[PDB]
């Protein structure tokens, strides 16, 4: 007999779900917190990431106060019958696309109290856009956002506020490339003003993450370094190596030339330099500077006293050491 | 009471037929359109497409929707009842993939004014087909087209008009990765004619300009370094043939591999892109370096001949620099002024 | 009055039954078909289909729906009441996926005349599969087929026909990037028979041609210049052992890699393609120059001099000459 | 007045329930199934699937749908109200994805005979998973299966049987780019048994053959040719140390890339395959030849002796190309028989 | 007739309300879970995913749905009336996607016994996600997780349980191209605690082993080929050789390009995978060839008879040394990883 008795509140009394709580009065205040099950798939090419979230909106409805129907502290409404109440029209503004998750029953929770509060929880999978600053590529720090706003109701009716205790809770997520941080900005105001409609509420969370340098050192630097080190052995070799010194130089520069394009293949099409390009060009010059020193050795011999080689064995390794010192210190 | 007035205004008692347009057997209905752009980008040349995220606002005047009793000037209504009101039929001619947004609730806005004015806003994502001209690919300017028409109503019934001020409002800080969106927009009328009848249409054009930063550092400057390298052969002695030929064979082949890399992502089209002209002519310069060495080798067949070989070497040591310089000047100044 | 008329003759009171065809237990109805082509999509080669966006128009007669009190010629109805009218079933036989368009409302048009001539227009996108024959892959005229069928009714009920004037209309300014669409289109009757019964069908076919511009720049000219480069070995000194062996091997490798790249974007068909004739014949010419240098080395090494040079100087004229001979065969047969 | 006849049966006055199987608590229902292959293709080896378009049709008997007042042989009921009649819960067990075709109207057909026979035809596109056997990758025969099974009805209630004539039909003028479809098709019964119960299932198997008109030009012809180019080194003078070393190494390295290239478009399996065994033995051939010139130099330049150096070279000129053909006979005949 | 019994229960008369739950304001209801694996899909290493097709069976005892007039036990019902039962909520945490099928009809099975036990079977496809450790990439054992929770109910209402026998049943004849699925599977509990409350959860984990077949043919044997091929320098000629440089460089260069392909498919990771140490150590051996020659070349030019003797002496010592030191590396590398 204790099903029809509580459904009296919603239907038989005309609770009009097209009418805001506290109508013709103060705006409704929504307390929001998010839980991040899965963080991953940060793609530079299409400028977006994907995350799985548990949005939990909370408001206060004066009509639904459960007035002595039941004696419990909380009433666990089933995931169904969620189309007969008023809900905030929240939507993300950096959304590329999103979808619900329906496996077996719908993943929805409704948890009313005596005081008329509501604790709706909902599982979503959202693809969000993140602008990327890649001026310092190998040693990088990326900043991402999330923007929650109401499409249809203005600021004088709907106001979004972050919870006080724990607004964002991580779930032991670990990323393959990036090294996320445990501190989040989490505050913003973001309040909009569209031309002809008016104000609307927004509130945003900023996620600080940092890239790891392990892969690049083995993938990009260490092959490049040995190729430059490889060219030093030509100085010891006799100047009469007619078609031996010549490859030792030209095969090293084409290999670097073919390499540099492949290294910057995954990344987006960006005009600005990125400081991985500085290393590639500086190495390309040094490999090239190894080739030209042989050609001048050949020109002056065909006229001896060929001392150019005898000091070049000191200078070229020595100058490369100093360039390394400046580069590593600056980008740190 | 709030609930009763919604029913009373447009109900069985009211006798409002959602399937009858206002001003029946009279003047055609006026429509005013506003467009706001949230996101813009992801332009793909291969599919000749680009994706947008827009807010679309339509305004008209249905006389039967007047509400004298409530003194407030504007009334915001729930989107649940939004399907029970007459709304004009609109669609995009160059549309390919369009989706609604339902992340928590439908992204719709409905406002009714006392005099009967109706404001209706929709959040839509669009994929649109934009033809392009690739005559000068790294330095091109494209013109995207957006068309809004009426599918089933003649101008005897429905007429589309742009906003009097003009409403194509791009959002703040929309920084395209590869292009630079211009401020100026074009608003034109292009009435459609079919065998069924005539239909109304409005069209808005965007102007996009492509950046040149990436192409020079990825394609031009790497290609330049290959050409400049081949010059070492002239300095090298005339008797180390393994030495000279070895540089020559590598230079011409690798440039060809670099050459293919330019049109890898581009569409397959009959006409010749300007990027091809630069890469083709500089392919000639490296190719000539192979032919000249043979002539030095060929003439060497026997002290009068060995002087002539020296003559050809020295005259190419100066003239070949000059011709490369002249080519660069002509190529850059011609396209950039266009 | 507007409200009463809408539901007077398609309403419950009239008793129009939507589930019953016009002229039931009588002669079959004739549906007239028209099409407008808005966009004609890309013809993919690997997934073996193409795309199109069309307006489909059907015209027929229903004697039940007539009127005489209102003197207007037509009654432009709301496109959301189509569930109350009989709509002939139409079927695309060679489809792989079709969708409706619902960006706003649902993009449908209905119009009823005085006699009962119902006009019905829909916007439909289609993915259609058409077979293509690639024996002449660089240049070839191709045909793409489109079939309009009837899944449910037999000959005694539904008969499809084309429009008497202007069956197919093409939107002005339509231009394909990779192909040329010909002005003339073929309309044909292909009635289908199955063990269930006899079903009507009509067919429209388009002719397409290829640009030929892209391939000449892409692989024809790079292949040709590589062949020319190999011939410079003849005039280099015979004694220079590393130069000509290095020259021959590098020429071979650029051709064998370039040959495979061309076919990467095409289906793995079993007939040899016209492009493959060019790539193989050039590779044979490329490889032939290496053999000549092996001939002169053995003749020189053994222990005359006039004979060894004689084959080289004859070859200087011979190798260019044969290549031009091959071209005049290739460029007449395919382009005839 | 056709309208009254349409709802006289299946109406509330008829009381035709649609959740109660025909001949309830009696003999099981016998269904005859036919398939019509509208199109075939989209065979992907990497993910092991193929896409088919089929016209499925079923026939069963319902005694409650017995009408006699019209003398027509058959009645063409409208395809819209299929929701209120009994239809079997057929499904495909080995599939990966399926969908109905909605283009203008719901692609359904129904016809009712006088005695109560029901004919029901649908159009559906199937993606089906088939195991691949690539032990002899080019020369292989693959059998692709198609299982039709009932999900919720035990065999004491629903039994599936093939048609007695024309069980599987193929549309005219159907061909594949790479494979061919043999006209012989194998029909068998494979009853499934789970811990929940016993369920009926019928299997149809097609046989496919891989044509060679592509792998010959793509793989066999190029990598075969390079072995000829390795042999030319034996004519070169013994002192051309840059030349001889130069030719030897490249031909080895260039078809290491081609060997890796060969396997790019095929699944990543551990067991040795037919295309692999050809590349490796070719690689051993050219790699061995380069070790000869090292063996030629060391024995010759140590210091008459030239006779030994010439001996090693001249016997190779006949031995090296001859030993290819004796391998070539063995490999080609075994796979093709 | 059949019809009244279907209407009498589950019907407007004496209304069975789907919203309320079995044993309301009472002990938590028991749910027993069975899973059958129809097919195990492609494990795409790039995006940490593996597709699984399963039949999911849930058994529970609803006391209200009981009958005694029909003597037949476990009567079956049409899947078209499933909307009016209480069904327990269930979701997979590690999912990235899911779908039903709907091929001809609704692929759901409903069975009601006399006492009230209900069996409910659904065909579902899942794209789950697995954390992985690629410390030893060619020789590794991986763990795949299947995790089931309840979304809208706590442990005061709903508790999940594994089946006592045959909880997870692998279809006969299942085999994977690159993984062996061990028949030993471990079942364990992992309770979720969130700020809303505690929710019931069960976990089933599989172990997969990767075999070294494909990698030997594709990578190890070509890598072993080059270092042997580069060794030709020792006996190819005497000290006068431009060619000796030529062999060494092209072997060094192609080793680096082969390095790029090795991890090109694999996801980028900071840690040093066991596949890298094989290529990195082998990279030094081909790299060491040029350094040896330049030492040989330098000694030759320093002549201004004893100098030339040293040049040969270096070679002879190194001819025996390199096979010895390579053997040491070869035995140590393979033994430690297999163990
Ligand atoms: C229903 O709630 C009432 C209180 O209103 C309580 O007395 C009763 O025990 C509950 N259960 C039933 C079956 O009535
Ligand atoms: C304004 O910004 C503050 C940041 O502390 C935030 O807490 C608050 O909710 C914002 N106001 C609205 C209406 O969103
Ligand atoms: C609005 O529509 C009326 C229809 O009679 C027309 O006269 C008027 O010019 C329109 N207003 C415009 C186009 O601004
Ligand atoms: C049109 O329909 C009538 C009767 O329905 C039929 O007799 C006639 O053959 C059909 N075709 C033409 C071209 O009139
Ligand atoms: C189906 O076939 C079996 C034997 O093949 C037969 O016993 C049974 O009666 C048949 N079913 C019906 C409804 O006749
Ligand atoms: C469910 O199982 C638990 C564990 O045995 C038990 O404590 C509980 O009472 C069960 N729920 C019932 C019997 O409703």
Automatic annotation (TrEMBL), chain A:
It is found in: Cell projection, Dendrite; Cytoplasm; Postsynaptic cell membrane. Coiled coil: none annotated. GO terms for cellular component: chloride channel complex; cytoplasm; dendrite; postsynaptic membrane. InterPro entries: Glycine_rcpt_B (IPR008060), GlyR_beta_TM (IPR047029), Neur_chan_lig-bd (IPR006202), Neur_chan_lig-bd_sf (IPR036734), Neur_channel (IPR006201), Neuro-gated_channel_TM_sf (IPR036719), Neuro_actylchol_rec (IPR038050), Neurotrans-gated_channel_TM (IPR006029). Pfam families: Neur_chan_LBD, Neur_chan_memb. One of its GO terms (molecular function) is extracellularly glycine-gated chloride channel activity. Glycans are attached at residues 2, 189. One of its GO terms (biological process) is intracellular protein localization. Residues 5-212 form the Neurotransmitter-gated ion-channel ligand-binding domain. The chain crosses the membrane at residues 215-237, 278-301, 310-330. Its main location: other. It catalyses: chloride(in) = chloride(out). Keywords: Cell membrane, Cell projection, Chloride, Chloride channel, Cytoplasm, Disulfide bond, Glycoprotein, Ion channel, Ion transport, Ligand-gated ion channel, Membrane, Phosphoprotein, Postsynaptic cell membrane, Receptor, Signal, Synapse, Transmembrane, Transmembrane helix, Transport. Subunit of heteromeric glycine-gated chloride channels. Plays an important role in the down-regulation of neuronal excitability. Contributes to the generation of inhibitory postsynaptic currents. NCBIfam families: LIC. Forms heteropentamers with glycin receptor alpha subunits. Heteropentamers with GLRA1 can be composed of two GLRA1 and three GLRB subunits, or three GLRA1 and two GLRB subunits, or four GLRA1 subunits and one GLRB subunit. Forms heteropentamers with GLRA2. Functional GLRB-GLRA2 heteropentamers contain four GLRA2 subunits and one GLRB subunit, although alternative subunit composition cannot be excluded. Forms a heteropentamer with GLRA3. Interacts with GPHN. This is Glycine receptor subunit beta. It comes from Danio rerio.
């Amino acid at each position: 007999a204790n099903s029809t008795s509580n459904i009296l509140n919603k239907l038989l009394i005309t609770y009009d779900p097209r009418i805001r709580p506290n109508f013709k009065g103060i705006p409704v205040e929504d307390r929001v917190n998010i839980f991040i099950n899965s963080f991953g798939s940060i793609q530079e090419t299409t400028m977006d990431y994907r995350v799985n979230i548990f949005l939990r909106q909370r408001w206060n409805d004066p009509r639904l106060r459960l007035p002595q129907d039941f004696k419990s502290d909380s009433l666990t409404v089933d995931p169904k019958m969620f189309k007969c109440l008023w809900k905030p029209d929240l939507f993300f503004a950096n959304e590329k696309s999103a979808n619900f998750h329906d496996v077996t029953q719908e993943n929805i929770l409704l948890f009313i109290f005596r005081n008329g509060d509501v604790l709706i929880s909902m599982r979503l999978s959202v693809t969000l856009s993140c602008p990327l600053d890649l001026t310092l590529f190998p040693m990088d720090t990326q900043r991402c956002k999330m923007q929650l706003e109401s499409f249809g109701y203005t600021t004088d009716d709907l106001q979004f506020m972050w919870q006080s205790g724990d607004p964002v809770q991580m779930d032991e997520i670990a990323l393959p490339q990036f090294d996320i941080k445990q501190e989040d900005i989490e505050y913003g105001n973001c309040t909009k003003y569209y031309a002809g409609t008016g104000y609307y509420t927004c509130v945003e969370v900023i996620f600080t993450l940092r890239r790891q340098v392990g892969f690049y050192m083995m993938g990009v630097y260490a092959p490049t370094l040995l190729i430059v080190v490889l060219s030093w052995l030509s100085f010891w070799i006799n100047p009469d190596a007619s078609a031996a010194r010549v490859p030792l130089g030209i095969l090293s520069v084409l290999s670097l030339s073919s390499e540099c394009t492949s290294l910057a293949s995954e990344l987006p099409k960006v005009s600005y330099v990125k400081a991985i390009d500085i290393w590639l060009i500086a190495c390309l010059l040094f490999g090239f500077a190894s080739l030209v020193e042989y050609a001048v050795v050949q020109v002056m011999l065909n006229s001896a006293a060929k001392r150019i080689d005898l000091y070049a064995r000191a200078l070229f390794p020595f100058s490369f050491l100093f360039f390394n010192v400046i580069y590593w210190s600056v980008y740190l | 009471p709030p609930s009763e007035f919604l029913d009373k205004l447009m109900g069985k008692v009211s006798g409002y037929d959602a399937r009858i347009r206002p001003n029946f057997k009279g003047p055609p209905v006026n429509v005013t359109c506003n467009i706001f752009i949230n996101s813009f980008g992801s332009i793909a040349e291969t599919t000749m497409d680009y994706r947008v995220n827009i807010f679309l606002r339509q305004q008209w005047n249905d006389p039967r929707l007047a509400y004298s009793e409530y003194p407030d000037d504007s009334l915001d209504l729930d989107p649940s009842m939004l399907d029970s009101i007459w709304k004009p039929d609109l669609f995009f001619a160059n549309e390919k993939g369009a989706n609604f947004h339902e992340v928590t609730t439908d992204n719709k806005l409905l406002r009714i004014s006392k005099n009967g004015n109706v404001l209706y806003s929709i959040r839509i994502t669009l994929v649109l087909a934009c033809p392009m001209d690739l005559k000068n690919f790294p330095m091109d300017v494209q013109t995207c087209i957006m068309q809004l028409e009426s599918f089933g109503y003649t101008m005897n019934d429905l007429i589309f008009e742009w906003d009097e001020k003009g409403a194509v409002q791009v959002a703040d800080g929309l920084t395209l990765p590869q292009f630079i969106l211009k401020e100026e927009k074009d608003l034109r009328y292009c009435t459609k004619h079919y065998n069924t009848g005539k239909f109304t249409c409005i069209e808005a054009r965007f102007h996009l300009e492509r950046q040149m930063g990436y192409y020079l550092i990825q394609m031009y400057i790497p290609s330049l370094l290959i050409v400049i390298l081949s010059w070492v052969s002239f300095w090298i002695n005339m008797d180390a043939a393994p030495a000279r030929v070895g540089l020559g064979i590598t230079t011409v082949l690798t440039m060809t591999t670099q050459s293919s890399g330019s049109r890898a992502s581009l569409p397959k089209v009959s006409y010749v892109k300007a990027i091809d002209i630069w890469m083709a002519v500089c392919l000639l310069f490296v190719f000539s370096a192979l032919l000249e060495y043979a002539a030095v080798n060929f003439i060497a067949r026997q002290k009068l001949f060995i002087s002539r070989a020296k003559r050809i070497d020295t005259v190419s040591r100066v003239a070949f620099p000059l011709v490369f310089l002249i080519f660069n000047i002509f190529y850059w100044i011609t396209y950039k002024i266009i």
